[PDB]
Coordinates of C-alpha atoms in Angstrom, one line a residue:
Chain A
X1 CA 0.4 0.0 0.0
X2 CA 3.1 2.7 0.1
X3 CA 4.6 0.7 -2.5
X4 CA 1.3 2.0 -4.5
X5 CA 2.3 5.3 -3.0
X6 CA 5.7 4.7 -4.3
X7 CA 4.4 3.8 -7.8
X8 CA 1.9 6.7 -8.2
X9 CA 5.0 8.9 -7.5
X10 CA 6.7 7.4 -10.1
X11 CA 4.0 8.0 -12.5
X12 CA 2.9 12.1 -12.1
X13 CA 7.0 12.9 -12.4
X14 CA 3.9 13.5 -19.0
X15 CA -0.2 13.8 -17.7
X16 CA -1.4 11.6 -20.1
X17 CA 1.8 8.8 -18.9
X18 CA 0.2 9.7 -14.7
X19 CA -3.7 9.6 -16.0
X20 CA -2.6 6.1 -17.3
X21 CA -0.7 4.7 -15.3
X22 CA -2.8 5.9 -12.7
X23 CA -5.5 3.4 -12.4
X24 CA -11.6 3.7 -4.4
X25 CA -11.2 6.4 -2.1
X26 CA -8.3 5.8 -0.5
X27 CA -6.2 5.3 -3.5
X28 CA -7.2 9.1 -4.6
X29 CA -6.2 10.5 -1.2
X30 CA -2.6 9.3 -1.7
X31 CA -3.0 10.3 -4.9
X32 CA -3.2 13.7 -2.8
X33 CA -0.4 13.1 -0.8
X34 CA 1.4 12.7 -3.3
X35 CA 0.2 15.4 -5.3
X36 CA 1.2 17.3 -1.5
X37 CA 4.8 16.0 -1.8
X38 CA 5.8 16.8 -5.0
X39 CA 4.1 20.6 -4.7
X40 CA 6.2 21.0 -1.1
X41 CA 9.4 19.5 -2.9
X42 CA 8.4 21.7 -5.5
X43 CA 8.3 25.1 -3.3
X44 CA 11.2 24.0 -2.1
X45 CA 13.0 23.7 -5.4
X46 CA 6.3 29.0 -12.7
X47 CA 6.2 24.5 -12.1
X48 CA 3.5 25.2 -9.4
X49 CA 1.3 27.0 -12.0
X50 CA 1.7 23.5 -14.0
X51 CA 0.8 21.5 -11.2
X52 CA -2.7 23.8 -10.4
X53 CA -3.6 22.8 -14.4
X54 CA -2.8 19.1 -14.0
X55 CA -5.0 19.4 -12.1
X56 CA -7.6 20.9 -12.6
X57 CA -7.5 18.6 -16.0
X58 CA -7.4 15.5 -13.4
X59 CA -10.4 16.9 -10.7
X60 CA -11.2 20.1 -3.0
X61 CA -7.8 19.6 -1.9
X62 CA -6.8 22.1 -4.4
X63 CA -8.1 24.9 -2.3
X64 CA -6.0 23.4 0.6
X65 CA -3.2 23.7 -1.9
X66 CA -3.4 26.7 -3.7
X67 CA -3.9 28.0 -0.4
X68 CA -0.5 26.8 1.4
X69 CA 0.8 28.1 -2.3
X70 CA 0.0 31.8 -1.7
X71 CA 1.2 31.0 1.9
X72 CA 4.6 30.4 0.7
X73 CA 5.3 33.0 -2.1
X74 CA 4.9 36.5 -0.6
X75 CA 4.8 39.7 -2.8
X76 CA 5.2 38.5 -7.0
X77 CA 4.8 35.5 -7.4
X78 CA 2.0 35.2 -5.5
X79 CA 0.9 37.9 -8.0
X80 CA 1.1 35.7 -10.5
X81 CA -0.5 33.9 -9.2
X82 CA -3.3 35.0 -8.6
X83 CA -3.3 36.8 -11.6
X84 CA -4.2 32.6 -12.6
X85 CA -6.6 32.3 -10.3
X86 CA -8.8 35.2 -11.6
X87 CA -7.6 33.3 -15.5
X88 CA -9.3 30.4 -13.2
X89 CA -12.9 32.0 -13.1
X90 CA -16.0 27.5 -1.0
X91 CA -14.9 28.6 2.0
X92 CA -11.3 28.1 1.0
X93 CA -11.6 30.8 -0.9
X94 CA -12.9 33.7 1.8
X95 CA -9.8 32.5 3.5
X96 CA -7.3 32.2 1.3
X97 CA -8.6 36.5 0.9
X98 CA -8.7 37.4 4.2
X99 CA -4.9 35.9 4.4
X100 CA -4.3 38.0 1.3
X101 CA -6.3 40.7 3.2
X102 CA -4.3 40.3 6.5
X103 CA -1.4 39.8 5.2
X104 CA -1.0 43.5 2.9
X105 CA 0.0 46.3 4.7
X106 CA -2.1 48.2 2.0
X107 CA 1.0 51.2 1.3
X108 CA 1.3 50.1 -2.5
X109 CA -0.8 47.1 -2.2
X110 CA -4.3 48.8 -2.3
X111 CA -4.6 47.4 -5.9
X112 CA -4.2 44.4 -4.9
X113 CA -6.6 44.6 -2.6
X114 CA -10.0 46.2 -5.0
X115 CA -8.5 43.3 -7.7
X116 CA -9.4 40.2 -4.9
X117 CA -12.1 42.1 -3.6
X118 CA -13.5 42.4 -7.2
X119 CA -13.1 38.6 -7.2
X120 CA -15.1 38.2 -4.2
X121 CA -17.7 40.7 -5.9
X122 CA -17.5 38.3 -8.8
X123 CA -17.5 35.3 -6.3
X124 CA -21.0 36.6 -4.7
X125 CA 8.5 81.1 10.7
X126 CA 5.4 81.3 9.1
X127 CA 2.6 81.8 12.0
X128 CA 0.4 78.5 11.6
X129 CA -3.1 78.3 13.7
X130 CA -2.2 75.2 15.0
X131 CA -5.6 75.8 17.4
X132 CA -7.2 75.0 13.8
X133 CA -5.3 71.8 12.9
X134 CA -6.4 70.5 16.2
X135 CA -10.0 71.4 16.3
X136 CA -10.4 70.8 13.1
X137 CA -8.7 67.5 13.8
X138 CA -10.5 66.7 16.8
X139 CA -13.5 67.4 14.3
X140 CA -12.1 64.5 12.5
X141 CA -12.1 62.5 14.9
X142 CA -15.1 62.7 15.8
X143 CA -16.5 61.8 11.8
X144 CA -14.2 58.9 12.7
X145 CA -15.9 58.1 15.9
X146 CA -19.4 58.1 15.5
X147 CA -20.1 56.3 19.2
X148 CA -18.3 59.0 20.5
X149 CA -21.5 61.1 19.1
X150 CA -23.5 60.1 21.7
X151 CA -22.3 62.0 25.3
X152 CA -22.8 65.5 26.2
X153 CA -19.1 66.7 26.9
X154 CA -18.3 66.1 23.4
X155 CA -21.2 66.6 21.7
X156 CA -20.4 70.3 23.4
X157 CA -17.0 70.0 22.0
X158 CA -19.0 69.3 18.9
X159 CA -21.3 72.0 18.7
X160 CA -17.7 74.8 19.4
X161 CA -15.3 73.7 17.1
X162 CA -18.2 72.7 14.1
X163 CA -19.6 76.3 14.6
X164 CA -16.1 77.7 14.5
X165 CA -14.7 76.1 12.3
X166 CA -18.2 76.0 9.7
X167 CA -18.1 80.3 10.9
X168 CA -14.5 80.5 9.6
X169 CA -16.0 78.4 5.5
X170 CA -18.3 80.8 5.1
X171 CA -16.0 84.2 6.2
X172 CA -13.6 82.6 3.3
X173 CA -15.6 82.3 0.4
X174 CA -13.3 81.4 -2.5
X175 CA -16.6 82.3 -4.8
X176 CA -14.0 79.9 -7.6
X177 CA 0.0 60.7 -9.3
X178 CA -3.1 60.2 -6.2
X179 CA -3.3 61.3 -2.8
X180 CA -5.0 58.7 -1.5
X181 CA -5.4 59.9 2.4
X182 CA -6.0 63.1 4.5
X183 CA -2.6 65.1 5.3
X184 CA -1.9 65.9 8.3
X185 CA -0.4 69.0 7.4
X186 CA 0.4 71.8 9.8
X187 CA 2.9 73.9 7.3
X188 CA 1.5 74.7 4.9
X189 CA -2.3 74.8 5.8
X190 CA -3.1 76.5 3.1
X191 CA -3.7 74.5 -0.3
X192 CA -6.9 72.8 1.1
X193 CA -7.9 75.9 2.4
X194 CA -7.8 77.1 -1.5
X195 CA -9.1 73.8 -2.7
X196 CA -12.8 73.2 -2.4
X197 CA -13.1 69.7 -3.5
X198 CA -11.6 69.1 0.5
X199 CA -14.2 71.1 1.7
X200 CA -16.8 69.2 -0.5
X201 CA -15.6 65.7 1.3
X202 CA -15.8 67.3 4.6
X203 CA -19.0 68.4 4.0
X204 CA -19.9 65.3 2.9
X205 CA -18.1 64.1 5.3
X206 CA -21.0 66.5 7.7
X207 CA -23.8 65.5 5.3
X208 CA -23.0 61.7 6.0
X209 CA -23.3 62.3 9.5
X210 CA -26.7 64.7 9.8
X211 CA -27.6 61.5 7.5
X212 CA -27.2 58.5 10.3
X213 CA -27.6 60.6 13.6
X214 CA -31.5 61.4 11.3
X215 CA -31.4 57.5 10.7
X216 CA -30.6 54.1 24.6
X217 CA -29.2 56.0 21.6
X218 CA -31.4 58.9 22.0
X219 CA -30.7 62.9 21.2
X220 CA -32.4 66.1 22.5
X221 CA -34.7 67.1 19.9
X222 CA -33.3 71.1 20.0
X223 CA -30.1 69.1 19.0
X224 CA -32.0 68.0 16.4
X225 CA -32.8 71.5 15.4
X226 CA -29.5 72.7 15.7
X227 CA -28.1 69.5 13.0
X228 CA -31.6 71.0 10.9
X229 CA -30.6 74.1 11.0
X230 CA -27.0 73.5 10.3
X231 CA -27.8 71.0 7.8
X232 CA -29.4 73.9 5.0
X233 CA -26.8 76.3 5.8
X234 CA -24.8 73.1 4.6
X235 CA -26.6 73.1 1.4
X236 CA -26.5 77.1 1.1
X237 CA -22.8 76.5 1.0
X238 CA -22.6 73.6 -1.8
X239 CA -25.5 75.5 -2.9
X240 CA -22.3 78.4 -3.9
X241 CA -19.6 76.3 -5.7
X242 CA -18.9 78.2 -8.9
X243 CA -19.9 75.2 -10.7
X244 CA -22.8 74.0 -10.5
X245 CA -24.0 74.4 -7.5
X246 CA -27.2 73.6 -7.3
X247 CA -27.3 70.4 -9.7
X248 CA -25.0 68.6 -7.8
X249 CA -26.6 70.4 -4.7
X250 CA -29.4 68.3 -6.0
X251 CA -27.4 65.6 -6.6
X252 CA -26.7 64.7 -3.6
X253 CA -30.4 65.0 -2.2
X254 CA -31.0 62.3 -4.9
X255 CA -28.0 60.5 -3.1
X256 CA -29.4 60.8 0.7
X257 CA -32.5 59.3 -0.8
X258 CA -31.0 56.6 -2.4
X259 CA -28.9 55.7 0.8
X260 CA -32.5 56.3 2.7
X261 CA -34.1 53.7 0.1
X262 CA -30.8 51.5 0.9
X263 CA -31.5 51.1 4.5
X264 CA -34.8 51.6 5.7
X265 CA -35.0 48.7 2.9
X266 CA -32.1 46.2 4.5
Chain B
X1 CA -22.1 52.9 5.0
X2 CA -22.3 53.8 8.3
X3 CA -18.5 52.5 9.1
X4 CA -16.1 53.9 6.0
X5 CA -17.6 57.6 5.9
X6 CA -15.0 59.0 3.9
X7 CA -14.4 56.5 1.0
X8 CA -18.4 57.3 -0.1
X9 CA -16.9 60.8 0.2
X10 CA -14.0 60.7 -1.8
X11 CA -16.5 58.4 -4.5
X12 CA -19.3 61.7 -4.0
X13 CA -16.4 63.8 -4.6
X14 CA -14.9 62.7 -7.2
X15 CA -17.5 62.1 -9.6
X16 CA -18.4 65.3 -8.5
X17 CA -15.6 67.1 -10.1
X18 CA -16.0 69.2 -13.6
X19 CA -14.7 67.9 -17.0
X20 CA -8.6 60.7 -18.5
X21 CA -11.1 57.3 -17.9
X22 CA -8.6 55.4 -16.9
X23 CA -7.3 57.6 -14.3
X24 CA -10.9 57.7 -12.5
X25 CA -10.7 54.3 -12.7
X26 CA -7.9 53.7 -10.6
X27 CA -8.9 56.1 -8.4
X28 CA -12.1 53.7 -7.5
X29 CA -10.0 51.1 -7.2
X30 CA -7.2 52.8 -4.7
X31 CA -10.9 54.5 -2.9
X32 CA -12.0 50.2 -2.9
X33 CA -8.1 48.5 -1.5
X34 CA -7.6 51.8 1.0
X35 CA -11.4 51.7 2.3
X36 CA -13.1 48.0 2.4
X37 CA -15.6 49.9 -0.2
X38 CA -18.3 47.2 -1.0
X39 CA -18.2 46.8 -4.5
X40 CA -21.9 47.3 -5.6
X41 CA -22.6 50.3 -3.3
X42 CA -19.4 51.6 -5.6
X43 CA -21.4 50.6 -8.6
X44 CA -25.3 52.5 -7.3
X45 CA -22.7 55.1 -6.6
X46 CA -21.6 54.9 -10.2
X47 CA -25.3 54.4 -11.8
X48 CA -27.4 56.7 -9.5
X49 CA -23.9 59.5 -10.5
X50 CA -24.8 58.7 -14.4
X51 CA -28.9 58.8 -13.4
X52 CA -28.1 62.0 -12.5
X53 CA -25.7 63.3 -15.6
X54 CA -27.1 62.7 -18.5
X55 CA -24.6 65.0 -20.1
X56 CA -21.4 63.1 -20.2
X57 CA -23.1 60.0 -21.9
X58 CA -20.0 57.6 -23.4
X59 CA -17.5 58.8 -20.8
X60 CA -19.8 57.0 -18.0
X61 CA -20.7 54.4 -20.2
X62 CA -17.4 53.1 -21.4
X63 CA -16.4 53.9 -17.0
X64 CA -19.4 51.0 -16.8
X65 CA -17.7 48.9 -19.6
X66 CA -14.3 49.1 -18.1
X67 CA -16.0 48.2 -14.8
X68 CA -18.3 45.2 -15.8
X69 CA -15.3 44.1 -17.9
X70 CA -14.0 42.2 -13.7
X71 CA -17.2 41.6 -12.9
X72 CA -20.6 39.0 -13.5
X73 CA -23.1 39.8 -16.3
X74 CA -26.9 40.1 -14.3
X75 CA -25.4 41.9 -10.8
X76 CA -26.6 44.7 -13.6
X77 CA -29.5 42.6 -14.0
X78 CA -30.6 42.4 -9.9
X79 CA -29.2 46.1 -9.4
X80 CA -32.2 47.2 -11.5
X81 CA -34.4 45.3 -10.0
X82 CA -33.8 46.3 -7.2
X83 CA -34.2 49.9 -8.4
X84 CA -37.8 49.7 -10.4
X85 CA -38.8 47.9 -6.6
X86 CA -37.9 50.0 -4.9
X87 CA -39.3 52.7 -6.1
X88 CA -39.0 59.4 -11.9
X89 CA -38.2 59.2 -15.1
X90 CA -34.6 58.7 -14.8
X91 CA -34.9 55.0 -13.6
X92 CA -36.4 54.3 -17.4
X93 CA -33.9 57.4 -19.0
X94 CA -30.3 54.8 -17.7
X95 CA -32.9 51.5 -18.3
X96 CA -33.3 52.7 -21.9
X97 CA -28.9 53.7 -22.1
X98 CA -28.1 50.1 -20.6
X99 CA -30.7 48.6 -22.9
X100 CA -29.6 50.0 -26.2
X101 CA -25.6 50.5 -26.5
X102 CA -24.2 47.7 -24.4
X103 CA -24.7 44.6 -22.0
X104 CA -28.9 44.0 -23.1
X105 CA -30.4 42.0 -21.1
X106 CA -34.8 41.8 -21.9
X107 CA -35.4 38.8 -20.3
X108 CA -34.1 39.2 -16.4
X109 CA -35.6 42.4 -16.5
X110 CA -39.3 41.6 -17.3
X111 CA -38.8 38.4 -15.0
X112 CA -38.0 41.7 -12.3
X113 CA -40.8 44.1 -13.8
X114 CA -48.3 41.8 -13.4
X115 CA -48.8 39.4 -16.5
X116 CA -52.1 37.7 -16.1
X117 CA -53.5 40.9 -14.3
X118 CA -53.0 42.6 -17.3
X119 CA -54.6 39.4 -19.4
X120 CA -57.6 39.8 -17.5
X121 CA -57.8 43.4 -17.8
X122 CA -57.8 43.0 -22.1
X123 CA -60.8 41.0 -21.3
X124 CA -63.0 42.8 -18.9
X125 CA -62.1 46.4 -22.0
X126 CA -63.6 43.4 -24.7
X127 CA -46.4 50.6 -15.1
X128 CA -43.2 51.0 -15.3
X129 CA -43.2 49.0 -18.6
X130 CA -44.9 52.1 -20.2
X131 CA -41.9 54.6 -18.9
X132 CA -39.8 51.6 -20.8
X133 CA -41.6 52.3 -23.8
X134 CA -41.1 56.0 -23.4
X135 CA -37.7 56.1 -23.6
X136 CA -36.6 54.0 -25.7
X137 CA -37.9 55.1 -27.8
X138 CA -36.7 58.3 -27.0
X139 CA -35.6 49.5 -31.3
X140 CA -35.9 45.7 -31.3
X141 CA -36.3 45.9 -27.9
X142 CA -39.3 47.4 -28.0
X143 CA -40.9 45.4 -30.9
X144 CA -39.4 42.4 -28.3
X145 CA -41.1 44.4 -25.1
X146 CA -44.5 44.3 -27.8
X147 CA -45.2 40.4 -28.1
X148 CA -52.0 42.3 -25.6
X149 CA -50.7 43.5 -29.0
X150 CA -52.6 46.4 -28.8
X151 CA -52.0 47.9 -25.2
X152 CA -49.7 50.5 -25.5
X153 CA -50.5 52.2 -28.9
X154 CA -54.0 52.9 -27.0
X155 CA -51.6 54.9 -24.2
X156 CA -51.1 58.2 -25.6
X157 CA -47.1 59.3 -24.6
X158 CA -45.9 56.2 -26.7
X159 CA -48.6 56.7 -29.6
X160 CA -47.0 60.0 -29.5
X161 CA -43.1 58.3 -28.7
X162 CA -43.4 56.7 -32.1
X163 CA -44.8 59.8 -34.3
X164 CA -41.8 61.4 -32.8
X165 CA -39.6 58.6 -33.8
Chain C
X1 CA 11.2 33.0 24.4
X2 CA 13.2 29.4 25.0
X3 CA 11.5 27.8 22.3
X4 CA 12.2 30.8 20.2
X5 CA 15.7 30.9 21.0
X6 CA 15.7 27.1 20.5
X7 CA 14.8 26.6 17.4
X8 CA 13.2 22.9 15.8
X9 CA 13.3 19.7 12.5
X10 CA 15.1 17.5 14.7
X11 CA 12.9 17.0 17.1
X12 CA 10.3 15.9 13.7
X13 CA 13.4 13.9 11.9
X14 CA 13.4 11.7 16.2
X15 CA 9.1 11.5 15.8
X16 CA 9.5 10.2 11.9
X17 CA 12.4 7.5 13.1
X18 CA 10.0 6.4 16.0
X19 CA 7.4 6.1 14.2
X20 CA 8.7 4.0 11.1
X21 CA 10.8 2.2 14.3
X22 CA 6.6 1.7 15.4
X23 CA 5.7 0.4 12.0
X24 CA 8.3 -1.6 12.2
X25 CA 7.5 -3.1 15.5
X26 CA 3.5 -3.4 14.5
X27 CA 4.7 -4.7 11.0
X28 CA 3.7 0.1 23.3
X29 CA 5.3 2.9 26.0
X30 CA 6.7 4.1 22.8
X31 CA 3.4 5.0 20.6
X32 CA 2.7 7.0 24.5
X33 CA 5.9 8.6 24.2
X34 CA 5.9 9.8 20.1
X35 CA 2.2 10.9 20.2
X36 CA 2.5 13.0 22.8
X37 CA 5.8 14.5 21.3
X38 CA 4.1 14.9 18.1
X39 CA 1.2 16.9 20.4
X40 CA 4.2 18.9 21.8
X41 CA 6.2 19.8 19.0
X42 CA 2.6 20.5 16.8
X43 CA 2.1 23.6 19.8
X44 CA 5.2 24.3 19.4
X45 CA 4.6 25.1 15.7
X46 CA 1.4 26.7 16.0
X47 CA 3.0 29.0 19.4
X48 CA 6.1 29.0 17.0
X49 CA 3.7 30.7 14.2
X50 CA 2.0 32.8 16.1
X51 CA 4.6 34.5 17.4
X52 CA 6.5 34.7 13.4
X53 CA 3.0 36.3 12.4
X54 CA 2.6 38.7 15.3
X55 CA 6.5 39.8 14.5
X56 CA 5.8 40.5 11.9
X57 CA 2.3 41.8 11.7
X58 CA 3.9 44.4 14.1
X59 CA 6.7 45.2 11.1
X60 CA 4.5 45.8 8.5
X61 CA 2.5 47.9 11.3
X62 CA 5.3 50.4 11.0
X63 CA 7.0 49.9 7.7
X64 CA 3.3 51.3 7.2
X65 CA 3.3 54.1 9.6
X66 CA 6.9 54.9 7.8
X67 CA 5.7 54.7 4.6
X68 CA 2.2 57.1 5.5
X69 CA 4.8 60.0 6.6
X70 CA 7.2 59.9 3.6
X71 CA 4.1 59.3 1.6
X72 CA 3.0 62.8 3.4
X73 CA 6.5 64.2 3.3
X74 CA 6.1 63.8 -1.0
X75 CA 2.3 64.8 -1.4
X76 CA 3.9 67.8 0.5
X77 CA 7.0 68.2 -1.5
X78 CA 4.4 67.1 -4.8
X79 CA 2.0 70.4 -3.5
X80 CA 4.2 72.7 -3.3
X81 CA 6.1 71.7 -6.4
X82 CA 2.3 72.0 -7.9
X83 CA 2.1 75.7 -6.1
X84 CA 5.2 76.9 -8.1
Chain D
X1 CA -6.0 28.1 11.5
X2 CA -7.4 25.0 10.2
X3 CA -3.3 23.6 10.8
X4 CA -4.2 23.0 13.9
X5 CA -7.6 21.4 13.3
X6 CA -5.5 19.6 11.5
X7 CA -3.0 18.2 13.8
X8 CA -6.1 17.9 16.2
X9 CA -7.0 15.1 14.0
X10 CA -3.5 13.7 13.4
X11 CA -3.0 13.5 18.1
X12 CA -7.0 12.4 17.6
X13 CA -6.0 9.2 14.8
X14 CA -3.0 8.4 16.4
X15 CA -5.2 8.1 19.3
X16 CA -7.5 6.3 17.4
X17 CA -4.9 3.5 16.2
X18 CA -3.2 3.2 19.3
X19 CA -5.5 2.8 21.4
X20 CA -5.1 -6.4 7.7
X21 CA -6.7 -4.2 10.0
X22 CA -3.1 -2.8 11.2
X23 CA -1.5 -2.4 7.9
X24 CA -4.5 -0.4 7.2
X25 CA -4.3 1.5 10.2
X26 CA -0.2 1.7 10.0
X27 CA -1.2 3.7 6.3
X28 CA -3.3 5.9 7.5
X29 CA -0.4 7.0 10.7
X30 CA 2.4 7.1 7.8
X31 CA 0.1 9.1 5.9
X32 CA -0.6 11.6 9.4
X33 CA 2.8 11.5 9.5
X34 CA 3.3 13.0 6.0
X35 CA 0.9 15.3 6.2
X36 CA 2.4 16.0 10.4
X37 CA 6.1 16.7 7.8
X38 CA 4.0 18.6 5.3
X39 CA 2.2 21.3 7.6
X40 CA 5.9 21.5 9.5
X41 CA 7.6 22.3 6.2
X42 CA 4.7 24.9 5.5
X43 CA 5.1 26.3 9.5
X44 CA 9.1 27.3 8.2
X45 CA 8.4 27.8 5.2
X46 CA 6.1 30.6 7.0
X47 CA 9.7 31.4 9.6
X48 CA 11.5 32.2 6.5
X49 CA 8.8 34.2 4.7
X50 CA 8.9 35.6 8.0
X51 CA 12.2 36.5 7.9
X52 CA 12.2 37.7 4.1
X53 CA 9.4 40.2 5.4
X54 CA 11.5 41.4 7.7
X55 CA 14.1 42.2 5.5
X56 CA 11.5 43.8 2.6
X57 CA 10.6 45.8 6.2
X58 CA 13.9 47.0 6.6
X59 CA 14.5 47.7 2.7
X60 CA 11.7 49.8 3.0
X61 CA 13.1 51.9 5.6
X62 CA 16.1 52.6 3.7
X63 CA 14.1 53.6 0.9
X64 CA 12.1 56.1 3.1
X65 CA 14.9 57.1 4.6
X66 CA 16.7 57.6 0.4
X67 CA 13.2 58.9 -0.1
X68 CA 13.7 62.2 2.8
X69 CA 16.2 62.9 0.8
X70 CA 14.2 63.2 -1.8
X71 CA 12.6 65.1 -0.3
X72 CA 14.7 67.5 1.3
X73 CA 16.5 67.7 -2.7
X74 CA 13.3 68.9 -4.1
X75 CA 12.5 70.8 -1.5
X76 CA 14.9 72.4 -2.3
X77 CA 14.1 72.3 -5.3
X78 CA 10.7 73.8 -4.7

């Protein structure tokens, strides 16, 4: 019975001769463990893609074998084998994709993670106002933590800082290679203020927070009236966009209605 | 949506710019890779932008073709069935665009959109399909919709669509 | 700590030799000792894998923080070049 | 994750084998030993991948130092 295992390893080491000399579950288990040993030797010693094509031609366990191969090969050959998997198209696929998401640091591999998620979707000096920096990014952390937006004192700081930042935004009145995340730079501070698109990001984030608050977990009705007043002022400031203020405002109204639709159905 | 706010904010503000397609594709892939974005919800955002922007047609058509080259074709059918069950002539406009140029799918949308009630109304005589016949004529697909024989011609606006054609 | 300093595969080779000796004897206490050694080797392999994964995750987080700082500096330099 | 369950199943199969039939049990025990050797080789490859990832992180830190030097040169050019 291990003599049959050695005969199987002689026959597999081309593929048509292995299929001829291969000729009922334990024999297939010995065959699959022979493929395990040969793939482990090839990982010790491209050819892995050829053996995966051989298993896909002959034949469960190739998911485990590809998971072992993706666990071994870190960065480049993992990318080529994932392009091979994209050319190929149960729970083992989700486990491999979760391992690829957890191992990558998303510093420059965000494109590869997006391809993974598309595959899963196919499956299923100068005077610097440092106080402005501190208040603005404390509000940004308030956006990051809506769970913190339920208390009293944190809500009071949110009220004060939000009214001061919106007062600065109303008082500015501008009237006119890719950067992934927000730039927490105390040095320049003026190119973000001169760019109206950054304020569009911030006011969209305000509108999403306001729609979430409208969507325990109770608030004062006066706070809700304040939210509605500031929401109407946000619609006023987004109507002040010199390229298509009212048009993009109606676009955001339609998007808010559709977000309400997606919430109330699900 | 309730966890990743900056990602959808960046999607809407990047689709909110004034008019390069592949650079915006790279930006969408970067936002999906950074903020763990659901690709179906990103597709919903792109479709609702194309509803709210009827000006730049073929640009967003090319973006949807390059996006749906990496996905399954039935996903747009289930999304349009979901949006038709959610309810607005912009829905009929985007369905007429997506059933004329490419990705044409008549059977599944007819399943998602009444037949025995229409037969009983035709026997007693002797909503959104009519809007699709309005927006589609605004051609062989309409003839496939035609097969009561004179129920569409019994409405005035369908006759106005055919007469403008 | 101590098992990470001592590491490894020689214990697996000794377990394989004990398995070969037990299969030759089958054609007692050695089988129990080999099973206990196999369980201890599996636990040590899982612990070493968890420690290596934690160290790799710490290095990846530190490299991601350094890459984010360098990308912020390069983005500030690119914005200063685009301003002029 | 799944390797721990496989190791526990191998230990349970070894305990059941210690508890034609003997030859089939010896073949199953040799199969479990081969699976355990494959798991040990996967653990060794994971340790080598962790060392290579630490080396790549050190290379990324050196590239970050070179990018900081390039950022200073770009500050002079700015």
